Design an enzyme around this catalytic site. Structure first.
Site, PDB file in Angstrom:
ATOM      1  N   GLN C  11     -42.807  23.779  63.950  1.00 16.44           N
ATOM      2  CA  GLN C  11     -43.488  24.683  62.985  1.00 16.44           C
ATOM      3  C   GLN C  11     -42.773  26.038  62.961  1.00 16.44           C
ATOM      4  O   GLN C  11     -42.273  26.416  61.885  1.00 16.44           O
ATOM      5  CB  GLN C  11     -44.959  24.865  63.357  1.00 16.44           C
ATOM      6  CG  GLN C  11     -45.692  25.852  62.460  1.00 16.44           C
ATOM      7  CD  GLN C  11     -47.165  25.915  62.773  1.00 16.44           C
ATOM      8  OE1 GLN C  11     -47.876  24.917  62.708  1.00 16.44           O
ATOM      9  NE2 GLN C  11     -47.638  27.100  63.118  1.00 16.44           N
ATOM     10  N   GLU C  71     -44.280  16.388  62.609  1.00 14.47           N
ATOM     11  CA  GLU C  71     -45.514  16.445  61.776  1.00 14.47           C
ATOM     12  C   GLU C  71     -45.125  16.803  60.341  1.00 14.47           C
ATOM     13  O   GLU C  71     -44.304  17.696  60.129  1.00 14.47           O
ATOM     14  CB  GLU C  71     -46.485  17.473  62.363  1.00 14.47           C
ATOM     15  CG  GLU C  71     -47.690  17.763  61.484  1.00 14.47           C
ATOM     16  CD  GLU C  71     -48.273  19.156  61.633  1.00 14.47           C
ATOM     17  OE1 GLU C  71     -47.514  20.082  61.969  1.00 14.47           O
ATOM     18  OE2 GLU C  71     -49.487  19.311  61.403  1.00 14.47           O
ATOM     19  N   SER C 140     -39.513  27.342  68.694  1.00 16.94           N
ATOM     20  CA  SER C 140     -40.466  27.992  69.632  1.00 16.94           C
ATOM     21  C   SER C 140     -40.176  27.522  71.061  1.00 16.94           C
ATOM     22  O   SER C 140     -39.694  26.389  71.223  1.00 16.94           O
ATOM     23  CB  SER C 140     -41.894  27.700  69.237  1.00 16.94           C
ATOM     24  OG  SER C 140     -42.039  26.350  68.810  1.00 16.94           O
ATOM     25  N   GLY C 146     -40.649  22.160  69.390  1.00 18.91           N
ATOM     26  CA  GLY C 146     -39.798  23.355  69.560  1.00 18.91           C
ATOM     27  C   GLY C 146     -39.075  23.356  70.898  1.00 18.91           C
ATOM     28  O   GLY C 146     -37.850  23.559  70.904  1.00 18.91           O
ATOM     29  N   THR C 179     -51.047  28.944  70.955  1.00 18.79           N
ATOM     30  CA  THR C 179     -51.963  27.837  70.568  1.00 18.79           C
ATOM     31  C   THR C 179     -52.109  26.817  71.708  1.00 18.79           C
ATOM     32  O   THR C 179     -52.831  25.821  71.500  1.00 18.79           O
ATOM     33  CB  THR C 179     -51.463  27.165  69.282  1.00 18.79           C
ATOM     34  OG1 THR C 179     -50.094  26.804  69.476  1.00 18.79           O
ATOM     35  CG2 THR C 179     -51.581  28.056  68.064  1.00 18.79           C
ATOM     36  N   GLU C 183     -47.746  26.686  77.578  1.00 19.68           N
ATOM     37  CA  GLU C 183     -46.517  27.197  76.909  1.00 19.68           C
ATOM     38  C   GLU C 183     -45.524  27.710  77.954  1.00 19.68           C
ATOM     39  O   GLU C 183     -44.321  27.541  77.773  1.00 19.68           O
ATOM     40  CB  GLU C 183     -46.865  28.241  75.847  1.00 19.68           C
ATOM     41  CG  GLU C 183     -47.493  27.622  74.606  1.00 19.68           C
ATOM     42  CD  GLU C 183     -47.654  28.528  73.395  1.00 19.68           C
ATOM     43  OE1 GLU C 183     -47.143  29.666  73.434  1.00 19.68           O
ATOM     44  OE2 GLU C 183     -48.295  28.092  72.409  1.00 19.68           O
ATOM     45  N   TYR C 224     -48.666  34.745  60.954  1.00 20.29           N
ATOM     46  CA  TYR C 224     -47.270  34.254  61.092  1.00 20.29           C
ATOM     47  C   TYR C 224     -46.443  34.772  59.909  1.00 20.29           C
ATOM     48  O   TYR C 224     -45.278  35.152  60.127  1.00 20.29           O
ATOM     49  CB  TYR C 224     -47.215  32.726  61.191  1.00 20.29           C
ATOM     50  CG  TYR C 224     -47.705  32.131  62.490  1.00 20.29           C
ATOM     51  CD1 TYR C 224     -47.371  32.682  63.720  1.00 20.29           C
ATOM     52  CD2 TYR C 224     -48.479  30.982  62.490  1.00 20.29           C
ATOM     53  CE1 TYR C 224     -47.815  32.125  64.910  1.00 20.29           C
ATOM     54  CE2 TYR C 224     -48.928  30.409  63.670  1.00 20.29           C
ATOM     55  CZ  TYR C 224     -48.595  30.981  64.886  1.00 20.29           C
ATOM     56  OH  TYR C 224     -49.042  30.414  66.046  1.00 20.29           O
ATOM     57  N   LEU C 252     -18.849  32.521  64.964  1.00 21.54           N
ATOM     58  CA  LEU C 252     -19.859  32.308  66.040  1.00 21.54           C
ATOM     59  C   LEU C 252     -19.241  32.544  67.424  1.00 21.54           C
ATOM     60  O   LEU C 252     -20.000  32.898  68.349  1.00 21.54           O
ATOM     61  CB  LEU C 252     -20.426  30.888  65.930  1.00 21.54           C
ATOM     62  CG  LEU C 252     -21.367  30.636  64.753  1.00 21.54           C
ATOM     63  CD1 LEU C 252     -21.687  29.155  64.634  1.00 21.54           C
ATOM     64  CD2 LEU C 252     -22.645  31.452  64.885  1.00 21.54           C
ATOM     65  N   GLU C 254     -17.016  34.884  68.173  1.00 23.04           N
ATOM     66  CA  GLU C 254     -16.995  36.363  68.324  1.00 23.04           C
ATOM     67  C   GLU C 254     -18.287  36.842  68.994  1.00 23.04           C
ATOM     68  O   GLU C 254     -18.185  37.809  69.760  1.00 23.04           O
ATOM     69  CB  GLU C 254     -16.830  37.077  66.980  1.00 23.04           C
ATOM     70  CG  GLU C 254     -15.405  37.095  66.451  1.00 23.04           C
ATOM     71  CD  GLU C 254     -15.043  38.308  65.607  1.00 23.04           C
ATOM     72  OE1 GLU C 254     -15.847  39.262  65.551  1.00 23.04           O
ATOM     73  OE2 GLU C 254     -13.945  38.301  65.014  1.00 23.04           O
TER      74      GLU C 254
END
Ligand SMILES: CC(=O)O[C@H](C[C@H](C(C)C)[NH+](C)C(=O)[C@@H](NC(=O)[C@H]1CCCCN1C)C(C)C)C1NC(C(=O)N[C@@H](Cc2ccccc2)C[C@H](C)C(=O)O)=C(CCOCc2ccccc2)S1
Ligand code: GTP
Ligand code: ACP
Ligand code: GDP
Ligand code: CA
Ligand code: MG
Ligand code: MG
Lengths: 346, 54, 439, 431
Positions: C11, C71, C140, C146, C179, C183, C224, C252, C254
């Site tokens: 998400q 999802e 996340s 995530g 949530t 976590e 959010y 990238l 650098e």
């Protein structure tokens, strides 16, 4: 109701602060590992500053300034005085000092020491760990001792001609209690103590450490005349101001306090940009214990700063209420003339 | 004050200012770990269906 | 010209993705149908913006992007959003059952079902690239997909693209918007597994972005949407060097060269100013000196920490708008005497500066005001380690009692992987101390 | 979408089950004919969670009605939302369980269980992605107690990777005079400890005490008790039924509420507590909701939360209010009651706000707590059990149906272990 945690059980000062806070009946003591607190009376070393100020719907305050150890460690203070362009070599009030490891300024110490011997000036220096203190006029003795100790010491210039109290001919050090609040207002507690020697200052022999070191501890144990002149070798500012007037024809305010007030400011103003919690996610206050020596020409010298200072039995009650009033109650107000002197700075 | 390597274009310009100078697991090992998990999953389920048979 | 493939996982990744590609589109003048009138080379080209956007023969500018979630709900809003015409249906990948805030489900149980499909879709973009630079991965730390799926993908990308750089945009968890209780677990597990496969990782503390929104944009309770609009401006400032003409951070590799001397210590601290309220009818426009000085105020940081109680290994200032070198040098000169900026002894006390004259774009009907000049300072400081310490302590509190561990062991993981991941974070904490502190 | 299959077993199960469907059907703007007549699209966004769509936009509850007695299921059919249910999903026997767990679990219920599972399969088959099952039943009776726990076990054997949710109405001498309910309950809890992920402890002791003391109903009816249940059941399922971030599915709820597999028995709470057909005029302020929902007098389990500690909590606010105020008041509660939240589970309280309020209230709050105080409930059942089982009283009813004393000794031991397990984590500290 406000909440606080006690993580230093030894701290005699904040043991009395916790006692006072609870007694008000608007504060509550949590278990030390409960994160939902407003005030933290934190542990001495390894204080988890990184965790403070991340609990939503709680203003969080701690009884220590993070990075104040730069001032309160002996080796750190020497480095600070030298390197800081704010204090500089325009600092006339800190005894000539060198950080000696068993990178290192052990070479440069001998260069300054050799100059004194050909000058025939007093070549007596003191070695102090960050009892455990050796005083000698010979450099070879001091360096061989530090190597045997194994920890990092500082070779400081011994105030050979100190101010001596009569009748007794006694050395002394002055302890000044300073409270820096969350807005960085420097508050000097009006009451200090003279932690006096009880034996006459002997110029010749430096091995008799009772008449040369003026710690309460080494006195009550090794002292042969403990409590004869003043109770628990503690003279207060009322009796000392009177002595100076009677003996020297001056006041404590004029002769000394102006210099003490200059040094406390100079030191704390220097580190403000490094430790200040003005725009931090948590706030800090801390009590400091500045140690001073006075020489025979009434010039104040700074010996060290103490980060976790113990108060004098007589004063605890007054000072601790001041901490609650000035440092704690200012952040967390209670529901329905000054013991401190606010050292004005900008 | 020491500006070095200034590059200018139309969109903007870039440079460097200096105040002071100085003083993996293989595809096999993955599958090995991923199946090992699924085998611990299947065994847990098997012993459940065994316990549910009883 | 060297191509960059963005990957949005879970998400948080997907929703932050939308905020970015919306902002990128406005910055490049790409309409929501994908048409770019300013582009006179129809079908292709080696322009700066092509690094992020492929071109069709019809003149559609298509993001080099893959959206993946276990999802359908969040990615369904991309498929039916304002920028629905922008993406091919192949780019938007979905499962039916999510990872239920469980790293184990994201990495093993559910993750293993869709990993091969995702790589296959990533390879389709890679094959369009004349010289693929690397990947930007948005996800996340807290989420199951995530945390779990990203670490699995980052492992597989290292295998399938050995020589290609991999940048992270990791959303560090905050309890104001979090949530799930577990976590901290998901955060440590993914950070450990990804550590060897990530070249440079920009952490964003939700708490930091949440407080900046409340304090600076006067938003009572940020959503959010509020956080994502602000996060997108930071990501856009960082990626601007890839998408626009310039010399600093043009590819990238650098990024790691400029910010990451120590491979494991690859977490730069991003600080952004000014963040000003669109509501504020009158606001003073802040000088170069003021916005530069603001980058050393912990309030303006993407992760709340104290750089004064650490050491710098690298410092990089990315300006946008009415900014000239003379002003920046002056601002830094003044800051040096005032602020406390200690570099490690082995790095030079320097600031790599890049200026883009185009001032920061703002999405119309947004929170952020249009400003003449803004800056984003990327600094590799040993103070970000505070973020690890906070997260690591919460891990220890729960794992001491093995609270919620059965949920992970149930999906096939061992208690071994927990203690293993934590010992790696204990090492990373020690690494950051060794580099940073004298006493 | 993520479909939930509802099962209601026995008199109690079918009653609180029926009331649940009456309430949430009204909240989703679905009439007894199963036709939508609602104003908001939030009503339909997640309708497929509890409802099967049909020809002519007709919404049919994914509900299976089970009982060994025809009596209660004739009542449900005759009732207002009796015609909404699928006629085939009515699975009933002719000879009841006579408040005997053995009859429900082993002998009588064993015959009918295969017929129920046929309907479960049919409903499970047509789910795009089944997230699991919710059962309503009593632990005091025979059918819901015995057959309900058998179904739970038989469903888990066919669907071992799906969440098993239950609304288990725990018995009380204040409501029922049936002497053997402590047996039925203890045997049921043993099954629930092993075979369910989430169990809402609906205590008849609490529901009667709320009705008598708070609502001032001198002679409460079952309907007066069920009014509290149906409000609670509406509240705890709010996150499942409407678009939200927190506890949106049954697994995510379990991952946020169940830190240890056996400790999955929740204390439901509700504010404001209302009398059936009495109109609240003054809307509660956010502070009032917050204080009330955490108060012992607003708990559907007859347990004092101050006698234990909260492992995890889920607060669900409903109606138009300030999200800033809820955030403040919820922090206020935690910050001024931090002794009653385990310090070894950081940020264990999680809050959800839903714009749509329930019927009759402008604002309401529902509380889901995994408190160690729940042991008080199990201790009360255990004392009642041991009183009788010590002298082997009323065991001829169970040993006549083929059961052994050993099963009772095991059920007793597992509950006493559940109690001491809760006490273990109550006395547990950070160090
Ligand atoms: C008033 C009444 O009959 O209430 C009954 C509920 C109580 C419980 C305490 C909740 N009971 C059983 C009694 O008051 C007993 N007393 C005792 O059991 C008592 C005796 C001394 C020792 C200790 N014990 C505990 C009386 C002797 C009856 C009933 N509630 C209902 C009921 O709710 N009826 C509903 C329909 C219904 C029935 C069952 C389940 C769901 C729904 C009708 C309406 C909607 C309503 O809610 O009032 C009972 C069933 C009969 O219902 C018709 C009826 C008859 C008389 C009065 C009220 C209702 S018995
Ligand atoms: N800034 C920001 N953080 C978000 C957003 N969505 C979720 N988060 C944060 O990310 C964490 C939740 O992870 P998600 O990304 O929702 O989870 P997911 O990757 O979909 O994984 P599962 O749903 O568990 O399978 C929490 O810390 C949230 O606060 C978003 O749009 N923006
Ligand atoms: N430069 C100097 N010249 C003369 N005497 C000195 C001195 N430095 C320290 N002293 C003496 O040594 C004593 C203790 O010194 P110091 O304060 O460094 O030790 P300490 O740290 O164990 C006690 P505290 O921590 O309370 O300050 C003082 O009482 C002082 O009289
Ligand atoms: N709260 C409530 N409790 C009930 C209801 N019906 C029965 N009970 C209780 O449940 C127990 C008996 O269960 P019951 O459902 O009658 O048995 P079953 O029909 O054989 O499962 C007793 O403790 C009753 O007080 C009801 O409608 N509401
Ligand atoms: Ca082109
Ligand atoms: Mg998700
Ligand atoms: Mg009955």
């Amino acid at each position: 109701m406000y909440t606080f945690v006690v993580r230093d059980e030894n701290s005699s000062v904040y043991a009395e602060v916790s006692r006072l806070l609870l007694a008000t009946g608007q504060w509550k003591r949590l278990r030390k590992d409960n994160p939902r607190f407003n005030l933290m009376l934190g542990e001495r070393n390894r204080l988890p500053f990184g965790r403070l100020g991340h609990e939503p719907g709680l203003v969080q305050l701690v009884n220590y300034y993070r990075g104040a150890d730069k001032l309160c460690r002996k080796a750190s203070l020497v480095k600070l005085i030298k390197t800081s362009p704010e204090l500089s070599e325009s600092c006339t009030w800190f005894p000539e000092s060198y950080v000696i490891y068993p990178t290192d300024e052990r070479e440069v110490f001998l260069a300054a020491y050799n100059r004194r011997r050909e000058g025939r000036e007093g070549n007596v220096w003191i070695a102090k760990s960050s009892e455990g203190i050796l005083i000698s006029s010979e450099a070879s003795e001091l360096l061989d001792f530090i190597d045997e100790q194994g920890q990092v010491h500082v070779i400081q210039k011994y105030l050979e001609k100190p101010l001596l109290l009569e009748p007794g001919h006694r050395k002394f050090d002055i302890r000044s209690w300073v409270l820096v609040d969350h807005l960085y207002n420097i508050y000097l507690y009006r009451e200090g103590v003279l932690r006096t020697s009880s034996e006459p200052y002997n110029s010749a022999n430096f091995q008799d450490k009772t008449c040369h070191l003026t710690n309460h501890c080494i006195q009550k144990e090794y002292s042969k005349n403990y409590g004869r002149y003043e109770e628990g070798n503690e003279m207060f500012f009322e009796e000392f101001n009177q002595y100076l007037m009677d003996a020297l024809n001056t006041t404590l305010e004029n002769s000394i306090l102006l210099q003490i007030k200059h040094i406390i400011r100079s030191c704390l103003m220097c580190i403000e940009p490094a430790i200040s919690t003005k725009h931090l996610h948590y706030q800090s206050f801390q009590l400091f214990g500045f140690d001073f020596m006075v020489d025979e020409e009434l010039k104040v010298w700074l010996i060290e700063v103490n980060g976790a200072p113990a108060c004098a039995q007589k004063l605890y009650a007054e000072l601790c209420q001041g901490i609650v009033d000035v440092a704690i109650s200012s952040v967390f107000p209670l529901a329905d003339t000054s013991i401190f002197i606010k050292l004005h700075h900008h | 004050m020491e500006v070095i390597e200034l590059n200018k274009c139309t969109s903007g310009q870039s440079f460097e200012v200096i105040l002071k100078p100085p003083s993996d697991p293989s595809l096999e090992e993955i599958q090995k770990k991923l199946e090992a998990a699924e085998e611990r999953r299947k065994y847990q389920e098997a012993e459940l269906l065994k316990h549910l048979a009883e | 010209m060297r191509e960059c493939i963005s990957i949005h996982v879970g998400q948080a990744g997907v929703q932050i993705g939308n905020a970015c590609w919306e902002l990128y589109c406005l910055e490049h003048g790409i309409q929501p149908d994908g048409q770019m009138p300013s582009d006179k080379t129809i079908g292709g080209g080696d322009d700066s913006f092509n690094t992020f956007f492929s071109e069709t023969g019809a003149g559609k500018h298509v993001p080099r992007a893959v959206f993946v979630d276990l999802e359908p709900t969040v990615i369904d809003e991309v498929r039916t959003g304002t920028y629905r015409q922008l993406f091919h249906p192949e780019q938007l990948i979905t499962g039916k059952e999510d990872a239920a805030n469980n790293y184990a489900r994201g990495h093993y149980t559910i993750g293993k079902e869709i990993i091969d499909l995702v790589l296959d879709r990533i390879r389709k973009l890679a094959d369009q690239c004349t010289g693929l630079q690397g990947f930007l991965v948005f996800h996340s730390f807290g989420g199951g997909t995530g945390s779990g799926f990203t670490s699995l993908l980052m492992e597989r990308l290292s295998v399938d693209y050995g020589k290609k750089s991999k940048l992270e945009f990791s959303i560090y968890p905050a309890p104001q918007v979090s949530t799930a209780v577990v976590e901290p677990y998901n955060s440590i597990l993914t950070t450990h597994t990804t550590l060897e496969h990530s070249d440079c990782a920009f952490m964003v503390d939700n708490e930091a972005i949440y407080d900046i929104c409340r304090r600076n944009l006067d938003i009572e309770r940020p959503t959010y949407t509020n956080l994502n609009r602000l996060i997108s401006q930071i990501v856009s400032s960082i990626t601007a060097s890839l998408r626009f003409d310039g010399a600093l951070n043009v590819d990238l590799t650098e990024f790691q060269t400029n910010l990451v001397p120590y491979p494991r210590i690859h977490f730069p601290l991003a600080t952004y100013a000014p963040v000003i309220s669109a509501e504020k009818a009158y606001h003073e426009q802040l000088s170069v000196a003021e916005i530069t000085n603001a980058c050393f105020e912990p309030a303006n940081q993407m992760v709340k920490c104290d750089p004064r109680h650490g050491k710098y290994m690298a410092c990089c200032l990315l300006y946008r708008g009415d900014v000239v070198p003379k002003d920046v040098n002056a601002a830094i000169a003044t800051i040096k005497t005032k602020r406390s900026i200690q570099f490690v002894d082995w790095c030079p006390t320097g600031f790599k500066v890049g200026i883009n004259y185009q001032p920061p774009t703002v999405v119309p009907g947004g929170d952020l005001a249009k400003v003449q000049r803004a800056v984003c300072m990327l600094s590799n400081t040993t103070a970000i380690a505070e973020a690890w310490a906070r997260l690591d302590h919460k891990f220890d509190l729960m794992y001491a009692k093995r609270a919620f561990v059965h949920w992970y062991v149930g999906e096939g993981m061992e208690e071994g992987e927990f203690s293993e991941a934590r010992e790696d974070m204990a090492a990373l904490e020690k690494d950051y101390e060794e580099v940073g502190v004298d006493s | 979408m993520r479909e939930i299959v509802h099962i209601q077993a026995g008199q109690c199960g079918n009653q609180i089950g029926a009331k649940f469907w009456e309430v949430i059907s009204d909240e989703h703007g679905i009439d007894p004919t199963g036709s939508y007549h609602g104003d908001s699209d939030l009503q339909l966004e997640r309708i497929n969670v509890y409802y099967n769509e049909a020809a002519g936009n007709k919404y049919v509850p994914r509900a299976i009605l089970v009982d060994l007695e025809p009596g209660t299921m004739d009542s449900v059919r005759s009732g207002p939302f009796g015609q909404i249910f699928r006629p085939d999903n009515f699975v009933f026997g002719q000879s009841g369980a006579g408040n005997n767990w053995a009859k429900g679990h082993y002998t009588e219920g064993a015959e009918l269980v295969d017929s129920v599972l046929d309907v479960v399969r049919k409903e499970s088959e047509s789910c795009d992605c089944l997230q699991g099952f919710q059962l309503t039943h009593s632990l005091g009776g025979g059918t819901g107690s015995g057959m309900g726990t058998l179904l739970i076990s038989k469903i888990r054997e066919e669907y071992p990777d799906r969440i098993m949710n239950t609304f288990s109405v725990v018995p009380s001498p204040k409501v029922s005079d049936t002497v053997v309910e402590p047996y039925n309950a203890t045997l049921s809890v043993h099954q629930l400890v092993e075979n369910t992920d989430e169990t809402y402890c609906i205590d008849n002791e609490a529901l009667y005490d709320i009705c008598f003391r708070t609502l001032k109903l001198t002679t409460p009816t079952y309907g007066d008790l069920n009014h509290l249940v149906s409000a609670t059941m509406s509240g705890v399922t709010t996150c499942l039924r409407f678009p939200g971030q927190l506890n949106a599915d049954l697994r995510k709820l379990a991952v946020n509420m169940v830190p240890f597999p056996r400790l999955h028995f929740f204390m439901p709470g509700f504010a404001p507590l209302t009398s059936r057909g009495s109109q609240q005029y003054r809307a509660l302020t956010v502070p009032e909701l917050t204080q009330q929902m955490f108060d012992a007098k607003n708990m559907m389990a007859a347990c004092d939360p101050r006698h234990g500690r909260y492992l995890t909590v889920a607060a669900v606010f409903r109606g138009r209010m300030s999200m800033k105020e809820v955030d403040e008041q919820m922090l206020n509660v935690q910050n001024k009651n931090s002794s009653y939240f385990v310090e070894w589970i950081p940020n264990n309280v999680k809050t959800a706000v839903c714009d749509i309020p329930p019927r009759g209230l402008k604002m309401s709050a529902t509380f889901i707590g995994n408190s160690t105080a729940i042991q008080e409930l199990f201790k009360r059942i255990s004392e009642q059990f041991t009183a009788m089982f010590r002298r082997k009283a009323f065991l001829h009813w169970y040993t006549g149906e083929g059961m052994d004393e050993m099963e009772f000794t095991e059920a007793e031991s597992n509950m006493n272990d559940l109690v001491s397990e809760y006490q273990q984590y109550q006395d547990a500290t950070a160090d």
